[PDB]
Every structure is written in structure tokens, then in C-alpha cells.
């Protein structure tokens, strides 16, 4: 039935800029005997519940700051933000209440900022862990930007591109950055049957691969 | 603030039941209509159920997906917005936010959002490992399911400079990491423990980073 389509799906901007989203409805949302455009806009901070921003297409929710201005009627509704504060990072959705509800795909707002260099840190496998017969080597690279980065695990000289699990974190509202942890799990055995370990990090912020290392 | 205490939900096998219990307080519950909205880990939001106030004979609307399976329900006196999930599938896995929303207005107040997992798998307590090397410190919560696990440093006290990475799954077992950047002097002089909990097995392990 009602199918909402947003655009752009992703948008990057710097602190203090007018960002314009967009939500297009499949069927008209303007109710005849009400003259209201049942289309609301919600935002969801990373790791939080959805927060309401705008309803009736233009009416702002209680406590919602002036920065947010809803607009539109019929089917092409637009969300607009001025002076995008760092804190504005979250995903923006447009739901519909004309006939049941149909949330929009969403729009992720990423913050373009100063390029930051990764601060690599490394930890051998915990002695406790070893007790069971496994060796998880963890390498962290916090507060870097842009998000694109490369961490290669090199044992003794060989590059080990296997058994490595790694995950980044959402762009920090506080200081619009990113962090990630690469983890090369091994076995007590194989861990022992090798000596040196390094964590290589090639990032746009550097011509030279950042490298940290711990040898037994 | 108007709260919405949503007890209920967790790991459940397919075709099993479940029944969450949203208990709000802060406005006039019996007079406002309520809703249940879910979010599959990663993806967007999905409205699932709606129960209109007494004024409209507790009218109910169920999204197509959860139709003929889920049963939203309320009890004005106790401010209890219930929801009976039956014939659970693998898709139903996700966060179930409980939100109140007046007729013809907007989804005014969203609650916290309990977790719900549907799988043939079983729970497993996580392993916590101290990753000792401003100084960077780590804490590795290895192998656990279903999600989630709360990772805190010193009974949550330590807030600044903490990076809890999203637990990525490997072979039907999750592993989560953590990094707390604590200044030089703060240790090993003092005690920097790592408190993690996994409600699914009431796994409270607070392994202290040492050495």
C-alpha cells in the first residue's frame, strides 16, 4: 500500500550546514476531512530508541529545537536542518499514519570532519584465555577519520588473512570519529609455534603504514 | 519523564510463544492509544501492533506480517500494554519498542525496547578476558548467545574514553570487545575492573584488569 521512499540514503556534511532530506509517498497523505498531511519524521541516535521530530508534515514535536523544519504536502515531504550540530548524527526516517503505518527506508547522516589518524594499540592473548587452549590477539585503532582503513595481521613476516574478526563503531557524536578492533584468534599451540606479531594499519592520514607489535 | 518499563523477551525457539509487558507511567494511560514497533537488528523500524483506548472498545490493528499470530492487549488499571507472540519465526528476531501515540497525532513517546531472539540454538555464558597492555586497556567478551551483553568499566562509573565494539557473530557465537583509555597515573595504582553481564544466563562476571 503506502510505500515511502527516501533520498538520499546517505549524506555527509560538516558542522554548520543546511541539510535537506526527502520522503516521497506512494499514495497521497493529505486527508480530505482533516486537511492534515499524516506524515511524521523521526530520528534515531545510534543505540537509542526512535525520537519524534515532526508530525502533521510541518508541526514540530514538543521540545524539538528550531533547527528542524518539516515541509511538504501530498507526497513529496522534505526534512530540512540548519546548523547541523555534531549531535545531529543518527538515522532519519519518515513514517506515515494515513492508513496504518509504513516507515521509510531511512537516511544516514554522516559528519565530514578533520581527518584523524588511528591510534593503534595491541594486546597479546590473555593468560586466562590461554588456560583453555586458545589465543585471541586483539588490536585496536581508535578515533580515526575517514572511516576507510586497513589492518593486516602479520605473524613473523607472513600475512595472516584468516580467522580475523573485526568491527567498527558508529561515528562518535562527541568527536565525530570511528574506532575498530581487529582480532586474530589462534590456538595456544599455533600461538606458541610462532614468535612475533604485528598490527599494520594503512590509513589516508599517513603515507607510512602505522605499525604496533608484540613479540613473546 | 514518562517512562515505559518493558519487561519480557529474550531467547525463544521457533514456533514458541512469548508475551512482552510494557508498563508505562507519566501520562493518562487509559485515555491514550498505544503501539508496538519493532526493529530487526540493523534494519529500520516496523510497526507491528496497535490497540486503541477504551473509548473505542479497545480497537486493534495488526500489521500484515504479524497478523493472526500476535495479539496486542491492555489493562488500563495496571497500565500494562501486553503483546502475545505465537508461531514465532526467525524474522521476528529483534528489538520491540513499546510506544504510546494519540489518535491522529504522532508516536509521541518510545520506550527503551526489550530484546527478543528466535532460534533453535541455546544460550551460552560469555568468556571475559583481561587485555592489559594515557594507557589503553581492553576487555574481551568471547563466545556468547543470544545477544546482548552489557560491558561496563568499574560498575559503569568510568564513562569517558570507552569504546565498546558491536559484538560480531562467528559460528553462531558472538564476541564483543572493549577499550578504556585511562590516563597513566590512574593505574596499575588503582583498580580498573571490567563488568560485563549477559541477562540470558544472568552471567555477571566482573574481571579486573591486572598486571
Amino acid at each position: 500500500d503506502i510505500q515511502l521512499t527516501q533520498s538520499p540514503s546517505s549524506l555527509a556534511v560538516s558542522a554548520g550546514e543546511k541539510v535537506t532530506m526527502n520522503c516521497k509517498s506512494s499514495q497521497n497523505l493529505l486527508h480530505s476531512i482533516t486537511r492534515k498531511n499524516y506524515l511524521a519524521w523521526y530520528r534515531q541516535k545510534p543505540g537509542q530508541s526512535p525520537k519524534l521530530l515532526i508530525y502533521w508534515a510541518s508541526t514540530r514535536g514538543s521540545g524539538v529545537p528550531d533547527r528542524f523544519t518539516g515541509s511538504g504536502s501530498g507526497t513529496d515531504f522534505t526534512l530540512t536542518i540548519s546548523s547541523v550540530q555534531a549531535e545531529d548524527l543518527a538515522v532519519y526516517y519518515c513514517k506515515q499514519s494515513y492508513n496504518l503505518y509504513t516507515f521509510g527506508g531511512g537516511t544516514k547522516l554522516e559528519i565530514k570532519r578533520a581527518d584523524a589518524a588511528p591510534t593503534v594499540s595491541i594486546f597479546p592473548p590473555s593468560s586466562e584465555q590461554l588456560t583453555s587452549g586458545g589465543a585471541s590477539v586483539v588490536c585496536f585503532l581508535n578515533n580515526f577519520y575517514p572511516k576507510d582503513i586497513n589492518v593486516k595481521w602479520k605473524i613473523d613476516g607472513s600475512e595472516r588473512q584468516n580467522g580475523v574478526l573485526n568491527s567498527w563503531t558508529d561515528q562518535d557524536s562527541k568527536d565525530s570519529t570511528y574506532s575498530m578492533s581487529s582480532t586474530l584468534t589462534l590456538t595456544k599451540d599455533e600461538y606458541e609455534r610462532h614468535n612475533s606479531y604485528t598490527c599494520e594499519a594503512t590509513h589516508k592520514t599517513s603515507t607510512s603504514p602505522i605499525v604496533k607489535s608484540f613479540n613473546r | 519523564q514518562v517512562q515505559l518499563q518493558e519487561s519480557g523477551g529474550g531467547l525463544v525457539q521457533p514456533r514458541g510463544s512469548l508475551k512482552l509487558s510494557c508498563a508505562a507511567s507519566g501520562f493518562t494511560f487509559n485515555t491514550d492509544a498505544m503501539n508496538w514497533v519493532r526493529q530487526a537488528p540493523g534494519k529500520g523500524l516496523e510497526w507491528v501492533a496497535r490497540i486503541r483506548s477504551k473509548g473505542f472498545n479497545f480497537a486493534t490493528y495488526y500489521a500484515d506480517s504479524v497478523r493472526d499470530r500476535f495479539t496486542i492487549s491492555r489493562d488500563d488499571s495496571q497500565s500494562m500494554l501486553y503483546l502475545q507472540m505465537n508461531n514465532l519465526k526467525t524474522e521476528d528476531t529483534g528489538i520491540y519498542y513499546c510506544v504510546r501515540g494519540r489518535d491522529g497525532e504522532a508516536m509521541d513517546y518510545w520506550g527503551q525496547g526489550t530484546t527478543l531472539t528466535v532460534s533453535s540454538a541455546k544460550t551460552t555464558p560469555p568468556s571475559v578476558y583481561p587485555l592489559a597492555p594515557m594507557v589503553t586497556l581492553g576487555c574481551l567478551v568471547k563466545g556468547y548467545f543470544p545477544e546482548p551483553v552489557t560491558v561496563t568499566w568499574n560498575s559503569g562509573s568510568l564513562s569517558s574514553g570507552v569504546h565498546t565494539f558491536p559484538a560480531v557473530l562467528q559460528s553462531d557465537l558472538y564476541t564483543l570487545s572493549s577499550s578504556v583509555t585511562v590516563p597513566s597515573s590512574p593505574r596499575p595504582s588503582e583498580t580498573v575492573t571490567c563488568n560485563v553481564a549477559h541477562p540470558a544466563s544472568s552471567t555477571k562476571v566482573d574481571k579486573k584488569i591486572v598486571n
Binding site: 482533516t34 499514519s97 | 490493528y61
Partner: peptide, 8 residues
């Protein structure tokens, strides 16, 4: 009666 209320 004739008054409209939106159920959603």
C-alpha cells in the same frame, strides 16, 4: 458522531 478522529 460526524466528528472525525484519525485512528492512526
Amino acid at each position: 458522531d460526524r466528528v472525525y478522529i484519525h485512528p492512526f
